[PDB]
Write a protein that binds this ligand. Structure first.
Ligand SMILES: c1ccc2sc(N3CCN(Cc4c[nH]c5ccccc45)CC3)nc2c1
Ligand SMILES: c1ccc2sc(N3CCN(Cc4c[nH]c5ccccc45)CC3)nc2c1
Ligand SMILES: [Zn+2]
Ligand SMILES: [Zn+2]
Ligand SMILES: [Zn+2]
Ligand SMILES: [Zn+2]
Lengths: 359, 359
């Protein structure tokens, strides 16, 4: 099975990275063990959706393209390595974002920095190593590949867009005209920047490039199939499915039980520009807006309870149903446009959409 | 002058990065201003030794190689951009290492994370952006250069070695057999790992690759002059000068006044494996070792004063003078070996050594 091959390549990449630390970096066995545990804890335990998208896109092309068996194996192995580059990039983001946000739990366990023998002093650097490993993988496994240059260039652009997205996210509750490194930042009082367009910018950059665009395009690159699809359609469909994925995440932060979510959601206390806050402000009357302003962005559980009640009473399920219906309609139109140049790729996009919509 | 051209290219690279954030990343003017201030605060104010080494190596080759004037200008501009890639890589390290170590001051001002409108939540990500900018520079300015592939591969290897070096540094006061993410780490009691070989490993990885190896080799790459020098000699001389630079830094942390140093040195309170601690343990009697163990790695200023007195009474100046004499002798031997294939490059190495030795 595809998942089995993907998971087997993790063990191979881990062994390569750790053996290289021993043969070239004078690592000792105890530090190699620490890094092995850090890699497992930070990289494993998710659903591997991003990495598996690379594998699925490559499998689709293998079914319609003439290749020797050894070439099919090479392409699948490259798709698995590429998929792990994305999972390790995600691991870097999660480690650093958990430290930045002072998060407590992730994937049902404590955040990496909270492990007793880790601490923030080590975890920041462990996060740096996770991203460095993505490059060591690429240069080693893809050394002689025709797609190495395009892959590294794409990966770097996606990583930069993601870091810019994190900046948009962490500053989304401040007034833009007050941003100033020299002055402590107050929370917005008018919430004028909680709009659909501003929310869409945050999400586009913080999530969609690395969660949807990069796995889809990497699958095309390892398949030598990019100059067969319309890139503007790939970007449009990735940014559309990516926003829906984040909207689902935002709703879950507020209403999915901590055991199912794997953490206690704190977007309200954190004053995040979430889909729920923007949608609520898009339909609230004057008294509801005033009540939201008096309670949002506060740790006090009674204030968080007022916000959750405002959301529940505003029938945000009706807005989500209308948003969902519109996304279903636009994703299906883009898949149709994708069929003009590639039915196989349009099918992988339909799979990606089905796994997102029904998660 | 060389410095003038180098500093002029900073303004050009800054404008390119910020204009790209506006034209491609939907940045707003307030966030572009925040990033401009972050870039200036974190990248400027040092001596630019690393970036200027790239420029000096390239100038040396220009003086002995036939080129059209436009080609000389292109090579110098590439050496300046490459130099800024290293200065921005250093800026990334300093931002993250100041957060990891809980440092207070850097280059005579507060550490970036301590600025009132920054905070750790933003500063970790600002540090990530600084390194992403090094890649955006390379792909933009060096898009059509023959050396792009070698330069990116070298840069990545140097960055990874540096992150591994940071891990060696932050864990240098723990016993290797006790490292365990699940268990809070006690400080060593035996100091058995405070040896010259272990100290040399820490320094080799945490400082020498990015401070000496990368600027020297990048100068060779932008000059299309690498396949003219013996790479094993370049690595040997970079690792030798780099260790001396760190030994000087270690001595300054302990004995250079806070105003000249630009910070209050805390290597003793931090229990760092410094040249001073290793050298002291290499000559101390049983009572001196016991007194060091009772006082090292503690915040108590009276305990720090006992350690500084132990160092002063141990005549570590005599050990430094012998170390220095040996480095002078070995650096001169390596420069001689470098003259076999390139007098010009051996001269740049002599300049680099003179600037390090007499800083
Ligand atoms: C899509 C978009 C918006 C929404 S709103 C939502 N709801 C389902 C659970 N309801 C009860 C509840 C569970 N936990 C709570 C905590 C506080 C207040 C109330 C509750 C609250 C509303 N479902 C969606 C789906
Ligand atoms: C190279 C290698 C080792 C050393 S040791 C050193 N010294 C110069 C200043 N001396 C006085 C001092 C200044 N500040 C202090 C604080 C506490 C105790 C004492 C002092 C202490 C010893 N110079 C070097 C140079
Ligand atoms: Zn976050
Ligand atoms: Zn969330
Ligand atoms: Zn440090
Ligand atoms: Zn120091």
């Amino acid at each position: 099975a595809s998942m089995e091959r993907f998971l087997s390549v993790y063990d191979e990449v881990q062994a390569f990275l750790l053996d290289q630390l021993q043969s070239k970096y004078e690592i000792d066995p105890n530090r190699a063990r620490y890094l092995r545990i850090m890699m497992d804890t930070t990289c494993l335990g998710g659903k591997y959706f991003r990495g598996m998208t690379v594998v699925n896109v490559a499998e689709g092309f293998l079914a319609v393209t003439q290749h020797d068996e050894a070439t099919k194996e090479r392409i699948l192995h490259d798709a698995c390595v590429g998929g792990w580059m994305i999972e390790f990039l995600q691991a870097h983001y999660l480690v650093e974002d958990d430290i930045m946000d002072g998060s407590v739990m992730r994937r049902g366990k404590p955040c990496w920095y909270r492990f007793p023998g880790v601490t923030t002093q080590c975890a920041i650097n462990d996060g740096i190593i996770l991203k460095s490993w993505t490059q060591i993988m690429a240069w080693h496994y893809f050394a002689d590949r025709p797609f190495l240059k395009d892959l590294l260039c794409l990966f770097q652009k996606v990583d930069y867009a993601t870091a810019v997205g994190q900046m948009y996210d962490v500053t989304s509750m401040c007034d833009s005209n007050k941003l100033d490194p020299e002055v402590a930042q107050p929370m917005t009082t008018d919430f004028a920047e909680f709009t659909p367009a501003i929310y869409k910018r945050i999400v586009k950059y913080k999530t969609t490039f690395y969660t949807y665009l990069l796995p889809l395009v990497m699958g095309l690159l390892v398949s030598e199939a990019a100059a067969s699809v319309e890139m503007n359609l790939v970007e449009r469909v990735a940014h559309l499915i990516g926003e829906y994925f984040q909207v689902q995440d935002d709703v879950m932060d507020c209403f999915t039980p901590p055991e199912q979510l794997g953490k206690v959601g704190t977007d309200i206390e954190d004053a995040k520009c979430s889909w729920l806050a923007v949608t609520f402000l898009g339909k609230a009357n004057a008294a509801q807006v005033a009540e939201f302003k008096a309670n949002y962005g506060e740790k006090d559980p009674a204030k968080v309870a007022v916000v959750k009640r405002l959301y529940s009473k505003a029938n945000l399920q009706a807005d989500f149903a209308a948003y969902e219906a519109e996304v279903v309609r636009e994703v299906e139109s883009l898949i149709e446009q994708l069929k003009v140049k590639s039915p196989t790729f349009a099918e992988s996009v339909a799979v990606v959409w089905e796994k997102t919509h029904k998660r």
